[PDB]
Amino acid sequence: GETLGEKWKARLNQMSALEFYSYKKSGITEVCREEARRALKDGVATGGHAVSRGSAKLRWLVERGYLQPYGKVIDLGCGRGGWSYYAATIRKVQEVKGYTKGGPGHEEPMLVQSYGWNIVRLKSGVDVFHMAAEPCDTLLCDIGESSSSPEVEEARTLRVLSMVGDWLEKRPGAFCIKVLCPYTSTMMETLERLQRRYGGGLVRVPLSRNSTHEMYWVSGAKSNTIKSVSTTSQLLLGRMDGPRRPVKYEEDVNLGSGTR
Ligand SMILES: Nc1ncnc2c1ncn2[C@@H]1O[C@H](C[C@@H](N)CC[C@H](N)C(=O)O)[C@@H](O)[C@H]1O
Ligand SMILES: [Cl-]
């Protein structure tokens, strides 16, 4: 019947504005973005700043061995490009190709000169659901829009996963795919099938806010899908009770500067 994550989602939808604001960041990990946010507002491109919070999330996965990027990196839904810029600093990465929709309401690629910027091409105006898949060594995808409806989250995740499949058939050796909604019975069954075909596992990145159940399907992970999902649901539900817990900070990403 009802999964733990579905219980989490229903309770999230019952929170007041104050409860939601306090719960959102209770006990999460975070980078302080004040220094980067000013620079990028001033139009600076050489301070080594990440363009987005996304860089810290991919760094977390890469630094803990869940993903080893190499060769040709594709970044689907690159937005401003936080994942692409981080990938460009990795020694074995040869090229980074990012694709994002852009337009009103959506994020545009940011052009900065952090280390390895010269091996990057960020392309806006691309709907990846209509782009032909091509071969690559590392496949990245950070697509999926949050919704108050778990029904919507499931459907958006399935669309992403069907699109990702065509790229995985080009047989990349590494991948990191956002799974917005892993917590429904259909989604757990879907990811068991995908795990059987392509390997990998699901990982909860602790920089994710408590207001999303997003997990990342990464090639270096092996965990049982149901256990990893249910563990994350338990964590998120427990944080809804008791007092607010402090945010834990890591230092923001410094990607350096220069060319490769
Ligand atoms: N069908 C789509 N095609 C291309 N881009 C999309 C599509 N749907 C959503 N997006 C974009 O994917 C991006 C998702 C971002 N959260 C990714 C953040 C990125 N990883 C970073 O570090 O900056 C958003 O900018 C979306 O506008
Ligand atoms: Cl998105």
d(CA 118, CA 151): 41
Ligand 1 atom at shortest distance from the alpha carbon of 78: 19
From the CB of 109, is ligand 1 less than 6 Å away? no
DSSP 8-state secondary structure symbol assigned to residue 93: E
DSSP 8-state secondary structure symbol assigned to residue 254: B
From the CB of 216, is ligand 1 less than 6 Å away? no
CB 217 within 8 A of CB 191: yes
Find residue 96's DSSP bridge partners. Answer: 73, 120
From the CB of 144, is ligand 1 less than 6 Å away? no
Two tokens at 143? 């697509």
Q: Which of 217, 207, 215, 143 is nearest to 176 (CA)?
A: 217
d(CA 77, CA 144): 9
DSSP 156-200: HHHHHHHHHHHHHTT--SEEEEEES---SHHHHHHHHHHHHHH--
Technique of determination: X-ray
Residue 91 CB burial class (10 angstroms; 0-12, 13-18, ≥19): exposed
Beta strands in 61-119 (DSSP E): 71-76, 93-99
d(CA 41, CA 39): 5
Cα-based torsion angle of the residue sequence 164, 95, 91, 201 in order, rounded to the nearest 10 degrees: 0
Q: How far is the CA of 256 from the centre of ligand 2 (A)?
A: 27
d(CA 182, CA 216): 9
Two tokens at 134? 């091509």
Question: What angle, rounded to 10 degrees, do the helices at 150-168 and 185-198 form?
Answer: 10
Helix H or strand E segment including 139: strand 138-141
Ligand 1 atom at shortest distance from the alpha carbon of 85: 22
All structural domains of the chain, each given as residue ranges with its CATH number in brackets, are 1-260 (3.40.50.150)
Q: Which of 113, 70, 122 is nearest to 256 (CA)?
A: 113
From the CB of 103, is ligand 1 less than 6 Å away? no
Q: What is the CA radius of gyration of the chain?
A: 18
Binding-site entries for S-adenosyl-L-methionine = 52, 82-83, 100-101, 127-128, 216
d(CA 87, CA 83): 6
Q: Helix, strand, or coil here: 41?
A: helix
From the CB of 54, is ligand 1 less than 6 Å away? yes
